[PDB]
Design an enzyme around this catalytic site. Structure first.
Site, PDB file in Angstrom:
ATOM      1  N   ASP A 133      48.478 -35.944  -7.926  1.00 51.79           N
ATOM      2  CA  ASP A 133      49.143 -37.222  -7.736  1.00 51.79           C
ATOM      3  C   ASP A 133      48.093 -38.062  -7.035  1.00 51.79           C
ATOM      4  OD1 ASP A 133      52.080 -37.086  -8.495  1.00 51.79           O
ATOM      5  OD2 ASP A 133      51.985 -35.346  -7.111  1.00 51.79           O
TER       6      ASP A 133
ATOM      7  N   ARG B 137      45.943 -53.633  -5.225  1.00 50.96           N
ATOM      8  CA  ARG B 137      47.294 -53.868  -5.716  1.00 50.96           C
ATOM      9  C   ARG B 137      47.658 -55.314  -5.319  1.00 50.96           C
ATOM     10  NH1 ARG B 137      52.940 -50.735  -4.041  1.00 50.96           N
ATOM     11  NH2 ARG B 137      54.261 -52.558  -4.496  1.00 50.96           N
TER      12      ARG B 137
ATOM     13  N   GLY C 218      51.266 -44.344 -10.142  1.00 54.64           N
ATOM     14  CA  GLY C 218      52.402 -45.201 -10.408  1.00 54.64           C
ATOM     15  C   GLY C 218      51.804 -46.546 -10.721  1.00 54.64           C
TER      16      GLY C 218
ATOM     17  N   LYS D  63      55.331 -34.614 -16.164  1.00 58.92           N
ATOM     18  CA  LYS D  63      54.544 -33.599 -15.461  1.00 58.92           C
ATOM     19  C   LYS D  63      54.741 -32.256 -16.158  1.00 58.92           C
ATOM     20  CE  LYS D  63      53.675 -35.090 -10.744  1.00 58.92           C
ATOM     21  NZ  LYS D  63      53.875 -34.834  -9.275  1.00 58.92           N
TER      22      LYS D  63
ATOM     23  N   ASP E 131      56.013 -33.223  -4.884  1.00 59.73           N
ATOM     24  CA  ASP E 131      56.638 -32.825  -3.626  1.00 59.73           C
ATOM     25  C   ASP E 131      58.142 -32.982  -3.527  1.00 59.73           C
ATOM     26  OD1 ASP E 131      56.802 -35.703  -2.992  1.00 59.73           O
ATOM     27  OD2 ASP E 131      57.111 -34.999  -0.936  1.00 59.73           O
TER      28      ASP E 131
ATOM     29  N   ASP F  12      60.028 -32.610  -8.957  1.00 60.66           N
ATOM     30  CA  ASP F  12      58.844 -31.928  -9.470  1.00 60.66           C
ATOM     31  C   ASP F  12      58.897 -30.409  -9.427  1.00 60.66           C
ATOM     32  OD1 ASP F  12      57.403 -34.345  -9.970  1.00 60.66           O
ATOM     33  OD2 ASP F  12      56.768 -34.374  -7.848  1.00 60.66           O
TER      34      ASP F  12
ATOM     35  N   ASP G 108      36.119   6.198   0.436  1.00 63.61           N
ATOM     36  CA  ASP G 108      35.723   5.248  -0.596  1.00 63.61           C
ATOM     37  C   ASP G 108      36.350   3.884  -0.336  1.00 63.61           C
ATOM     38  OD1 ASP G 108      34.251   7.143  -1.891  1.00 63.61           O
ATOM     39  OD2 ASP G 108      35.161   6.740  -3.869  1.00 63.61           O
TER      40      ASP G 108
END
Ligand code: TG1
Ligand code: NA
Length: 994
Positions: A351, A560, A626, A684, A703, A707, A800
């Site tokens: 993400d 943005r 996004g 996803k 999270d 998901d 061993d």
């Protein structure tokens, strides 16, 4: 049980045919309760210890190992000679090992926990309904709620089911749908229907999801769906329907065992064919009745010899340590076996904001209109300093500082940023840092106004816990916030209705301040404010506005942008239905553009580098955001998923575009794709499916319970430290620091762990090869037992083990991240290496046998038939005269054994060294390259000199060894191995594949 979010309120009431004021009638309840069942997720089915242990004994080996734990036991009784009260150790030890195993798998499992169980934590025990058999709300158990009855929820409550909202009593309703997505920002719900019947939960504004919490308010609704048919219920289904394959290593062992078995049986087949002469030459007598027990006590040997008894322990202690290791590097790996798969991850889908970036916003640029005259247009760009939400910073024009107030356009831009914002700032003392409060992008906007007090208000005299919301508060006190129209992904914007405070600013009374995505608002703008004045928005001024909008968002700035406007003559108060989020875009029109602002969510330092490591590592990296495709791509370049001048058309898709593709091209897009823009629900998961069809080990991050189904499907699901609990439990690893770099860091440790792991495995497996040879010869030559399972065990468990687990700490190669990910289908041992241990084994197989057959023939302590007749030692007691003339029990002597075993040991401490590297020489890869290895070899040796010289122990097998000639023999027998290996290793030159 509907799709209520698209139906009307009367339509849902109609569907179930229920009364909002009465509720379901007891008949309806039973009818419904029957048809729809109870409101709960299928019970958990965790097998019992009985069912556990059983499985603990399903591994072909553990079974073969147990079958032999009997024969030994059966043979340990039919001993008949009292002077053998140690015949029960061999059986007892085995069972102990077997047991000890089950003791673990039962404790280990019992402590692990599935996410499908974590889901039942969101199921509130009680709920409030309204039914016809009473007038006041009945408080019943969620379990018993039914599709169709009227429910009531309020502020503190955990929504018990997928509910269509019927009517909101409180002035507003807020819900914390964080257990779904992770974000805690409460959302406003409404009553009017949502047209689209295929709408994502995010846009079901009139719906209440079972699992979520009422943030603010109180409302009444009608239950649309119950139990598994609910949003969370569906997910539980998906996660249940998902099957997770076995780690490729477990795949490889399971195979080894399968084969280990087939061989074993074959050996017996052959052994029997070797001594088939006992059909034509043997005669009727009582001698053979003592030959059966031989072919049996020789099998249980043949077993402990074959199986690498200690291996499970060495591995689990290695992974254990690696875990704790990775943990120090912020990688919390739940489930050990994953440390393997983690190391072979082909692709990593991460993400963006949480992990790739810091999720720490700040406005770097703004621009208001400076002038519009004819076709001539001029803006007014700026730059704002300060990454932290801290109010510390400066506004500049062409790098020169400025007094924000000297501009009109700005004072408005500021007021909007201050009024049309639902976030705030705070200054904590616990760590004297300026902390966000609301939304990450808004709490930035507020910070922006603190940095540019349009009114120059005096603040340097204020404390930090006041400097927090100063310039902001002043603007808040110049306009009254009548109310605010919330953000909705349709109009992608928001606004606040305001009125002034008295006649101090009654200028034009009521105003509407709106912020949102540029594309959207700018069309809803018919005017542009050239600082304290307005002019008819026109073609150019618009192109200019948008142009900078693309530079700021697609250019290297990768920002943005939020267009900012105000409706000067907003519709009249009473002419607005403030609770039907559809007429909002409408109310937000005939606007006047005042300015756009740009902010940045800075990639993380280590990220730029980690992305590179992956390139070197041949590990593909896919970003999931996004962000609009445009900026998604820009950001990818900024970090290196793409090259500044690389073509991307076919390598970056937007959630929608992906859907617009046919299942076929939808699969292609994935193998090539490196960027997914505005990904929707399934995606996803759908994506992980394709990546797997191309047989790629894939990493996925996420999270929220939204998901969980993907995190479970991917080979390595990655949860955030700050992620929800369901996400975490659905994941293999958890980034305590949500850092994308922590991922790579791990993938690397993984590759290192396996390389060493890989060797210490061959080491032990190779020994087990030789051990079996020794047991074969012993049998084909009739020769007395050169080695006992009890000894064999100890060897494989301690003598061993120690060096093997030491090998785990072999220094790491320097190009572990410069080589493509390993192939899952890569065998641990094949070709020329197969040949080497094929030889090395054969070596020890002979070596050991001969050293026992030596103490017999050609030795100066117990001389046996050097004519080789020792082979018929079975014939001695009775056949006393016929070529014997001596004691009949020398064959049962201990030293001839302590010989074969001492040579074994040494050969093993030797082989253990030929393991420091697969094809390098010890003169290139000296044994001290691993201090541990050596330190352990010593510890193992002193232990060997402990099963000889201690007292109780020596009886349990063997006796002692003559310091020299006997030990010296051992040495002129073992040591040679190194050369044998070195020679075969040297074959890495007479064929270049180093
Ligand atoms: C443990 C002891 C023994 C003797 C054994 O049977 O191992 C075989 C076996 C099952 C394999 C082989 C063994 O084959 C032999 O040693 C030949 C038989 C000679 C014995 C006859 C006596 C008259 C492995 C041990 O050895 C070599 C060097 O030839 C290597 C490897 O194993 C691995 O990579 C380990 C998997 C963790 C496997 O070929 C494996 O088969 C597979 O599917 C693998 C990929 O597993
Ligand atoms: Na998984």
């Amino acid at each position: 049980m509907e799709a209520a979010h698209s139906k009307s309120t009367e339509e849902c009431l109609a569907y179930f045919g229920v009364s909002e004021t009465t509720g379901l009638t007891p008949d309806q309840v039973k009818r419904h309760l029957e048809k729809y069942g109870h409101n709960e997720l299928p019970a958990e089915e965790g097998k019992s210890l009985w069912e556990l242990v059983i499985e603990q004994f399903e591994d072909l080996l553990v079974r073969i190992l147990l079958l032999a734990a009997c024969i030994s036991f059966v043979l340990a009784w039919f001993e008949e000679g009292e002077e053998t009260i140690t015949a029960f150790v061999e059986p007892f030890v085995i069972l102990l090992i077997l047991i000890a195993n089950a003791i673990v798998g039962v404790w280990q499992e019992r402590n692990a926990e599935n996410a499908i169980e974590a889901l039942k934590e969101y199921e509130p025990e009680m709920g409030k309904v309204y039914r016809a058999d009473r007038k006041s709300v009945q408080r019943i158990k969620a379990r018993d709620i039914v599709p169709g009855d009227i429910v009531e929820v309020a502020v503190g409550d955990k929504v018990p089911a997928d509910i269509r909202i019927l009517s909101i009593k409180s002035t507003t309703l807020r819900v914390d749908q964080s257990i779904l997505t992770g974000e805690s920002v409460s959302v406003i719900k409404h009553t009017e229907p949502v047209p689209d019947p295929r709408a994502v939960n995010q846009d079901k504004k009139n719906m209440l999801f079972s699992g979520t919490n009422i943030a603010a308010g109180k409302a009444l609704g009608i239950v649309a769906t119950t139990g598994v048919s609910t949003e969370i219920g569906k997910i539980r289904d998906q996660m249940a329907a998902t099957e997770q394959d076995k780690t490729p290593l477990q795949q490889k062992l399971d195979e080894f065992g399968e084969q280990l078995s087939k061989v074993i049986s074959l050996i017996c087949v052959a052994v029997w064919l070797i001594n088939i002469g006992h059909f034509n030459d043997p005669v009727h007598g009582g001698s053979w009745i003592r030959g059966a027990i031989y072919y049996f006590k020789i099998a249980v040997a043949l077993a402990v010899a074959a199986i690498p008894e200690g291996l499970p322990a060495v591995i689990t202690t290695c992974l254990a340590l690696g875990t704790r290791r990775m943990a120090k590097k912020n990688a919390i790996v739940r489930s050990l076996p994953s440390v393997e798969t983690l190391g072979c991850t082909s692709v990593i889908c991460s993400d963006k904001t949480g992990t790739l970036t810091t999720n720490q916003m700040s406005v770097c640029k703004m621009f208001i209109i400076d002038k519009v005259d004819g076709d001539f247009c001029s803006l007014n760009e700026f730059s704002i300093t300060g990454s932290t939400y801290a109010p510390e910073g400066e506004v500049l024009k062409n790098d020169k500082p400025i007094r924000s107030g000297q501009f009109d356009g700005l004072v408005e831009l500021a007021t909007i940023c201050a009024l049309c914002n639902d976030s705030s700032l705070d200054f904590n003392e616990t760590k004297g840092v300026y902390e966000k409060v609301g939304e990450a992008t808004e709490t930035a906007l507020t910070t922006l106004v603190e940095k540019m007090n349009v009114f120059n208000t005096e603040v340097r005299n204020l404390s930090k816990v006041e400097r927090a919301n100063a310039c902001n508060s002043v603007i808040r006190q110049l306009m009254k916030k009548e109310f605010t129209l919330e953000f909705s992904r349709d109009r992608k914007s928001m606004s606040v209705y305001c009125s002034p405070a008295k006649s101090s600013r009654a200028a034009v009374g009521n105003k509407m301040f709106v912020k949102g995505a540029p594309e959207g608002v700018i069309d809803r703008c018919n005017y542009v404010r050239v600082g304290t004045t307005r002019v008819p928005m026109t073609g150019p001024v618009k192109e200019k506005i948008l142009s900078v909008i693309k530079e700021w968002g697609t250019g290297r700035d990768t920002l943005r942008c939020l267009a900012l406007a105000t409706r000067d003559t907003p519709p009249k108060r009473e002419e607005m239905v403030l609770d039907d989020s559809s007429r909002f875009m409408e109310y937000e029109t005939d606007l006047t553009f005042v300015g756009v602002v740009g902010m940045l969510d800075p990639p993380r330092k280590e990220v730029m580098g980690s992305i590179q490591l992956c390139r070197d590592a041949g590990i593909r990296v896919i970003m999931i955001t996004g962000d609009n495709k445009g900026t998604a791509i820009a950001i990818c370049r900024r970090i290196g998923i793409f090259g500044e001048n690389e073509e991307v058309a076919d390598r970056a898709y937007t959630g929608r575009e992906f859907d617009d593709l046919p299942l076929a091209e939808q699969r292609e897009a994935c193998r090539r794709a490196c960027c997914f823009a505005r990904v929707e629900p399934s995606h996803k998961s759908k994506i992980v499916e394709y990546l797997q069809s191309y047989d790629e080990i894939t990493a996925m991050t996420g999270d929220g319970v939204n998901d969980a189904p993907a995190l479970k499907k991917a080979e390595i699901g990655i949860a955030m430290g700050s992620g929800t609990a369901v996400a975490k439990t659905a994941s293999e690893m958890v980034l305590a620091d949500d850092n994308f770099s922590t991922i790579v860091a791990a993938v690397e440790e993984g590759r290192a762990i396996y390389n060493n792991m890989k060797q210490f495995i061959r080491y032990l497996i190779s020994s087990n090869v030789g051990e079996v040879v020794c047991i074969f010869l012993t049998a084909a030559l009739g020769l007395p037992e050169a080695l006992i399972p009890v000894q064999l065990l100890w060897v494989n468990l301690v003598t061993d083990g120690l060096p093997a687990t030491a090998l785990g700490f072999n220094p790491p190669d320097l190009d572990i991240m410069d080589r493509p990910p390993r192939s899952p289908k890569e065998p641990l041992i094949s070709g020329w290496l197969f040949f080497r241990y094929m030889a090395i084994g054969g070596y020890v197989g002979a070596a050991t046998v001969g050293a026992a057959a030596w103490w017999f023939m050609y030795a100066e302590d117990g001389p046996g038939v050097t004519y080789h007749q020792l082979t018929h030692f079975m014939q001695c007691t009775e056949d006393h005269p016929h070529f014997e003339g001596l004691d009949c029990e020398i064959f049962e002597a201990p030293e001839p054994m302590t010989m074969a075993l001492s040579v074994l040991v040494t050969i093993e401490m030797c082989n253990a060294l030929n393991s420091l590297s697969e094809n390098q020489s010890l003169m290139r890869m000296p044994p001290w390259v691993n201090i541990w290895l050596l330190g352990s070899i010593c510890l193992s040796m002193s232990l060997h000199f402990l099963i000889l010289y201690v007292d109780p122990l020596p009886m349990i097998f063997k006796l002692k060894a003559l310091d020299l000639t006997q030990w010296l023999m051992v040495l002129k027998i073992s040591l040679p191995v190194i050369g044998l290996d070195e020679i075969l290793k040297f074959i890495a030159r007479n064929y270049l594949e180093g």
